[PDB]
Write a protein that binds this ligand. Structure first.
Ligand SMILES: N#Cc1ccc(O[C@H]2CN(S(=O)(=O)c3ccc(Cl)cn3)C[C@@]2(O)CN)cc1F
Lengths: 623, 179, 61, 135
């Protein structure tokens, strides 16, 4: 009488009239509504989700009759449960639909029989957009209510006699409801408003009940705190609101991270927390993720919050400036020694193995210092592979290209040493090139200044890119032109030889300056096309040089650009954190920024021992 | 503009593509918009919901792969274009017997295949920017014909045949501060 | 130094044992010198719009 | 706290009974950062009308110099500079009522023409604190 299409259609019609009377037929035949031959073979969905999806006008009387039928059939525990065996809805249950349709009556009614409030929506549709999904909200009904602006639904799910979902419950990835609330929030005003509102609501409600460590301190499978993931994913609003969290309730004071140490005259101090913003090694810190692993599009605006900028300034003043100056003076001394070694290096015959002289011993000391610097750079670059590394670092201006230049310098100094020990005379030729690249790499230490304005306005990467384009253009064009020269008997003038390319490029370099000679024009057997090619080469050389000139003019006329400044702050923060990471744990503890302070009291009279950073402000507006 | 499904922080929509993009058996809107259209306002139109996402989806599907294969193949062909290492001594029809002599030989064959490939590709459009690609090709065939004929004056046109090839390669950064 | 103006003759590149790398290291020298000289000029001789015409003129009175 | 505290009246009431009224309200803080801050300075800087009224009603001292390191401008390495006189403090901290009462009071008034330890009068302090903001 009743088949799966028949029941599905009659329940989608939203009419509890024709369905009545199925009870005797179903009970005498010994069937259950969850039978394999009774639900859809593809989805596995039962009739109740069909009624819920086909909801009209907010209410449908078929569901109460359907659940009554379920309770008569002795299937109620299994009736309201539907692990869809689809590859897209692995776990979507009736409560997920009920919350998904924004109905308070049904979200009350389905849990009134106590089916489940912990169904995991592990389907490919309920996965983060990065992993190939459409909407990620965690994998809890409570998380579903929280992530879609359902305050009443969350409140009902918390304080309900039937069965309540604990806020500490974790999804398949370990993410809690706070993690999901972070994951849903994009940086827009209307979104972040209710996101922060409900974040504070959930935090306060979980602080009231279960008086223990706050839910914000729980970690997922990879250990990311909600603040940590908020910084990692690039969400300015939630991150900023988490930093400046103040709660005036006496019971819930430990949830605050910005205090009011002393309001004394028209200068107002503040006491920002530093538990998760700066740690001396034995913890993950939000700053290292914010600088290293974060969404680059808005990495700059996140750094401009009240504690972070002044935390970086304090780290600078404490040890960053001193260590940076020591590093730059040591680097300059090392490359001065390198220059002295290169200039005083003998060049006759075989590599100058026979030192046996105090001056030659000093030269050997300089050479071994240079090799030590090269191998140190190489080992520091390689060791990063076993650490935080492997970004798209091929042209990045976040120290991902200066590390590449350091790698090039190190490997080329190593190969220069190898050729020097193997008797190859070109060790000098490669060593001078390494020295030049090192002297240009010395521009790395220009990140300690903002004179300074015109130093910052010019970018080395734009200059190096144009330089590398020009050199390859010149070499490739000379290779084309030298083909036209007829072979043999002279070699460079009025002829061609297998070696003439080394000297012909000199003629082009002199001619583009203005000191060249038209002697090679008579050298080729076909001057009619040779003149055209030379003219095109000169025109393109002038175009490249002048285009670079307008590039410099446009880049330096503005002085301070919108982006040309955020980038500088990014490099400055990266340098500060790289300096900090090179110190031992105890040394970082000695240089731990901020002062120890007892912000307040907690349960059992235990003082709140949190490292804090003072940021004083002046304001003649509010009294 | 259909409204397939919607749930709070998601509102799916289904845009039609009956006329915006037609593969073969119909005229299309985007081709007219980009090629035969009023140039002064060609960017106002591309700021609509479907067309921008249509181009992005085309890129993600095949455009990135096709462009990155094309640029690499073109640069490899240009680098192989062996002009510096052509036989200095001897008659222009130089036989190939040495194992290193025949090594370059290949490169010449692949350059000839690229030249005839662009020649046929542009001719297919003529029989049914691109102006340079036509002269980018026919010079290669002329040099090959001169090489097989015996005329010694083939290298002068051969070099200029694909010196323009680098200017053709320059079109990859602008559509094949600013240049 | 004469290379910067161009007065001096460039016969020294015929003496280097490696003209292939000497020329590369000299082209970058010219580009670096030109950029470094142009930057100080655009920073000093150039320099809001009428600030100078107001202040420097009022100084004379 | 809360704008009122009943311990101060009782403390003063004990103070006159102890027979030390003139000396009790005098606190020349010997700290390196507070060389001169007294009860009147603290009462005025807290912007509480009633307590300063009661305090100057007996007229303990109205000419203390806030010569400490904290009460110095940012150039000298301080946090808030308003001059060194309590009248200068009241005028700097937007207290027209406090200045008015401190000038025309029955017990004793402070000289408005007095110069601070640096020679500045109240007007110089007002000029020094007034940054170029509308409020
Ligand atoms: N004082 C000091 C100081 C310390 C590290 C640093 O750079 C960091 C960026 N890179 S680097 O460009 O390759 C690089 C540059 C300089 C040096 Cl001496 C060795 N390596 C890796 C890095 O994180 C170090 N592990 C820069 C500094 F000024």
């Amino acid at each position: 009488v009743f088949n799966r299409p028949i029941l599905f259609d009659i329940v989608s019609r939203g009419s509890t009239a024709d369905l009545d009377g199925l009870l005797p037929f179903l009970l005498t035949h010994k069937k259950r509504l969850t039978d394999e031959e009774f639900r859809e073979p593809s989805t596995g969905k039962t009739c109740l989700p069909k009624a819920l999806l086909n909801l009209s006008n907010g209410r449908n009387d078929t569901i109460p009759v359907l659940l009554d039928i379920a309770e008569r059939t002795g299937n109620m525990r299994e009736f309201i449960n539907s692990p869809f065996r689809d590859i897209y809805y692995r776990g979507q249950t009736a409560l997920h639909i009920a919350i998904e349709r924004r109905c308070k009556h049904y979200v009350e009614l389905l849990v009134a029989q106590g089916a489940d409030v912990h169904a995991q929506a592990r389907g490919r549709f309920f996965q983060p957009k990065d992993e190939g999904g459409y909407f990620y909200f965690g994998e809890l009904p409570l998380s579903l209510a929280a992530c879609t602006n359902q305050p009443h639904i969350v409140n009902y799910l918390t304080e309900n006699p039937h069965k309540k979902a604990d806020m500490r419950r974790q999804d398949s990835r370990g993410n809690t409801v706070l993690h999901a609330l972070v994951a849903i929030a994009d940086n827009t005003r209307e979104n972040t408003k209710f996101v922060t509102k409900m974040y504070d609501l959930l935090l306060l409600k979980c602080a009231r009940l279960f008086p223990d460590s706050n839910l914000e301190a729980v970690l997922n499978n990879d250990g990311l705190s909600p603040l940590m993931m908020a910084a990692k994913t690039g969400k300015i609003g939630i991150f900023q609101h988490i930093i400046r969290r103040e709660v005036t309730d006496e019971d819930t004071r430990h949830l605050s991270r910005k205090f009011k140490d002393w309001a004394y005259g028209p200068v107002y101090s503040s006491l920002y927390d530093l538990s998760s913003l700066d740690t001396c090694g034995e913890e993950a810190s939000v700053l290292e993720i914010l600088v290293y692993n974060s969404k680059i599009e808005n990495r700059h605006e996140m750094l401009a919050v009240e504690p972070i900028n002044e935390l970086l300034r304090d780290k600078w003043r404490k040890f960053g400036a001193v260590s940076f100056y020591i590093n730059v003076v040591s680097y300059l001394c090392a490359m001065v020694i390198f220059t002295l070694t290169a200039y005083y290096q003998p060049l006759e015959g075989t590599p100058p193995y026979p030192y046996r002289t105090t001056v030659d011993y000093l030269r050997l000391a300089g050479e071994v210092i240079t090799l030590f610097t090269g191998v140190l750079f190489f080992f520091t670059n390689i060791k990063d592979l076993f650490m935080k590394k492997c970004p798209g670092v091929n042209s990045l201006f976040i120290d991902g290209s200066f590390q590449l230049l350091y790698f090039i310098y190190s490997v080329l100094v190593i190969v220069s040493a190898a050729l020097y020990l193997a008797g190859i005379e070109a060790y000098l030729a490669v060593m001078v090139f390494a020295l030049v690249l090192g002297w240009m790499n010395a521009l790395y230490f220009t990140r300690g200044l903002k004179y300074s304005i015109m130093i910052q306005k010019i970018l080395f990467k734009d200059l190096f890119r144009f330089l590398l384009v020009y050199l390859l253009f010149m070499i490739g064009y000379a290779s084309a032109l030298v083909s036209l020269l007829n072979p043999c008997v002279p070699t460079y003038p009025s002829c061609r030889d297998s070696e003439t390319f080394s000297t012909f490029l000199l003629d082009l370099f002199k001619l583009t300056i203005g000191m060249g000679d038209l002697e090679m024009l008579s050298s080729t057997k076909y001057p009619v096309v040779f003149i055209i090619l030379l003219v095109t080469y000169i025109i393109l050389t002038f175009v490249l040089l002048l285009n670079m000139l307008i590039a410099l003019m446009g880049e330096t006329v503005g002085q301070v650009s919108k982006e040309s400044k955020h980038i500088w702050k990014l490099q400055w923060a990266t340098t500060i954190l790289d300096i900090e990471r090179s110190f031992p744990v105890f040394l970082r503890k000695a240089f731990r920024s901020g002062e120890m302070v007892t912000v307040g009291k907690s349960s059992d009279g235990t003082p709140d021992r949190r490292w804090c950073f003072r940021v004083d402000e002046v304001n003649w507006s509010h009294w």
